[model samples]
Target: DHVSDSFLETNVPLLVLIEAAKNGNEKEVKEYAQVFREHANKLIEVANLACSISNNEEGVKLVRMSASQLEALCPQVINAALALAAKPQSKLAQENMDLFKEQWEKQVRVLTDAVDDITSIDDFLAVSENHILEDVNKCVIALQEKDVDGLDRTAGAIRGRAARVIHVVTSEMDNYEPGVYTEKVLEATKLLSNTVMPRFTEQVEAAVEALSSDMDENEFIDASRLVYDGIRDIRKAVLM
Candidate 1:
């Protein structure tokens, strides 16, 4: 949630609102930019929520996903928002207007980073899956061996490496083309998304759920497994 909040506040929400306002939506103009206001509020609200979640594991996961969503949606949102902001405004709107533009410029960089060459999410999920799978297996083995330190180390490494991998792969795939070499790249990435990530996310979530909450291990695992599978399937369908 922390990441989500950061992204929202950084300028995406305002940008989206601005863009929406310019979309010639009579609703925005007649309603005094209602759509823009809603999106702006959402950005602020989400950011505040994210800040609260930054420290906890559950919060972290929620924030990350939230951030990812904001990242994906920000571009279109910004385009709409800027267009609306360009309209004639009363003194009050103008006074408050710079707030949006300032935030927009600042958030522009964030969006750039968020959308980077790592643009495609499928690549991110691929690296995330592989790292989690390997590390979760290690953590499980370490627990059985009563190696607390090893488990901790393995988990930490897994998270860091996995995130880095996600970042790198996402950037790389952002520039990918569905031409010629598309066949091979698509095949490998698709395999990872289908066969790998769901299982990976499932295992990690199950373990964490048991460790953090009163969640029944089997039930949690089952639910998470379903989620991973669902997400994986989503990746496959969309990427194809």
Candidate 2:
């Protein structure tokens, strides 16, 4: 409810809008554009709440600024979607829609991170850890199904989530007095970002290459499975 709700709200409507435009349903696109705007407002409202309760002055400032940017970007996204819906056959409309899609997702991620800063750090880490695990499983399925694009996208998402966890955890630790717990948490994050992530990325690349060459994917799958063990170990360490 804390993180997933906000993340999904921003993404789900936009995805629907994109699909509607792709299907050349101007009516559906217009309907979803309104939904997207409403969800965007919900995110903004949550961001304000997060900012209001945050004690970190810098974090609050960042959250407010990003929230403001998100607010401003919402209408532009609707306009882009509207344009795409009007001319679904136009390649330029497709490109413009893609641009807005990227921009909207990026800004949502920024605001989401900023909101996390003011929310419960423990909950944030728990959710992020679970999300990584789910993504790792998705990567495996994508590999087995010969879904190169799916595998690449999921792997990238895993990397991004890991980096975000490291960033947020490190930032939170800074607000606390140095201690054994803090040191252990920091060490876990360093191992994840520096060691585990690199290995996982290499596995993803190798798997893609092998798939292209009609090589046995089992080896790559085995290598990719190790990423879950690495992340689970980190979660345990952080909990300890």
Candidate 3:
């Protein structure tokens, strides 16, 4: 729980910072940049802790290297935000800001996943699956409330956590001997990636499409609810 909680602390604030920058709020942007700077440091600090706990030499090395990269990348991202703050109206500023945002998010995800791998794998899976479950509930509520942006964002997070589960679980399986436990774990991962997630994606797309067409809101809500159900089913299967 703490690991996932710490991981979330690093990325969620950046979303708010991005929104502030996009709206040309220079003062808020500057304040958020400082917050983002601290977030990056927190991530690096957590990554180091993860490395310390992991006995796998290569895994620890990867985590540390990624942490170093994050350390290097954070300043560039802060500079990008400052540039955007200085010229909120310039197309160049907007483009550069967007590029930095994309890069920052991508790199952080990599570091997050890597650090997650080096720590307790089962704990990571447990936390990630639970987080996805929460996000799935959020998606359903957002859809019912007709908050399209909230719905989209929550769904995107579910997808991201799901991908992380698949990636980490698959990689962790490699360290285990070929046996029933490994087989079960691999089967669960395959089922989640191939069957459950696809259904969830379809439902998310259907809900979005129905919302845009002003079609049956109940149908959209039902589809959104199924995503939550599917995620729960996947978690149960994994736990088994």
Candidate 4:
């Protein structure tokens, strides 16, 4: 649910839509256009959500105003794609697409940076903690069901989100004066990363292999619960 998560991973959809159109696949282009439109809406919507939680009126206003511009640009981007789809060999269509692609990317980066400037790291982590709670629960169920692929997929997300939490927490620490608060957060973060995550991943691997010959459900369950506790403590340390 991090706004950047939407913006960062969104590098793909526009390119995908363009490639389909470049290949002159009208049917494929239409489907890709819808996906791209949906994705654009998501970016705008998430930026608005980010704006709601933040208090930097300047940044928030910039985000909303630019988000509006992006909303207007989405259909125009699609129109350009449609034109290219109709005339794949037309140099003029291709050039129009190139210009639109560059503009779309620039506008998105502008919004992303504005969103980043306004967000509170603690609020970001608080939301991330909740997301981790759900993902960790999902991973637990996957483990019980012995669905290896589901386990792998969900676990990957959990790990990735955890790393992000750690990264954001650590970086933001330097922006504040040092103290018990900093030390506590840093300690919890390192413990989760260097010790807990390492240890948990070890157990998850063994558990993953155990699916072939498995049984230590309680141990693996304990491992996951520790992760949640760790995230909770980080929030507690920050909020305290």
Best of the candidates, TM-score: 2
Please identify model 1 stretches exceeding 4 Å from their true place.
1-137, 146-153, 174-177, 190-195, 208-240
Candidate 4 wrongly placed segments (more than 4 Å): 1-118
Q: Evaluated with lDDT, which candidate comes out highest? A: 4
Candidate 1, run of 10 with poorest lDDT: 111-120
lDDT of 1 by residue, 1-240 (tens): 223324433544454445445454545443444544465456545544544534445434544444555555444444444444555344444444555466455554443333221323554455345545556666666655656566567756664654454334444556777564545544544544455545655565556545555534454334334433433443454455
User: How much lDDT does each candidate structure score?
Assistant: 0.48, 0.78, 0.72, 0.81
Q: List model 2 lDDT by residue over 1-240, tens digit each.
A: 354644533588999999998877988888998888888887888777777767778778987888888888888888887777788888998898889889888888777766764687665566666677788789889998989999999999988877877787788779889999889888877877777778778889988887888555666666666666656655666676
Across residues 57-128, which tens digit of lDDT does each residue of candidate 3 receive?
Answer: 877887777778777877887777667667777789888877877877777876776676666765566556
Candidate 4 displacement at residue 128 in angstroms: 1.1
Q: What are the models' TM-scores? A: 0.27, 0.56, 0.52, 0.55
Name the candidate, 2 or 3, with the larger lDDT value: 2
Clashes of 4: 0
Which tens-of-lDDT digit does each residue in 65-140 have in candidate 4? Answer: 8798888888889999999999999999999888999888888876765666567766566666766788888888
lDDT, ranked from best to worst: 4, 2, 3, 1
Score residue 57 of candidate 2 by CA lDDT: 82
Task: List the candidates ranked by TM-score, beginning with the highest.
Answer: 2, 4, 3, 1
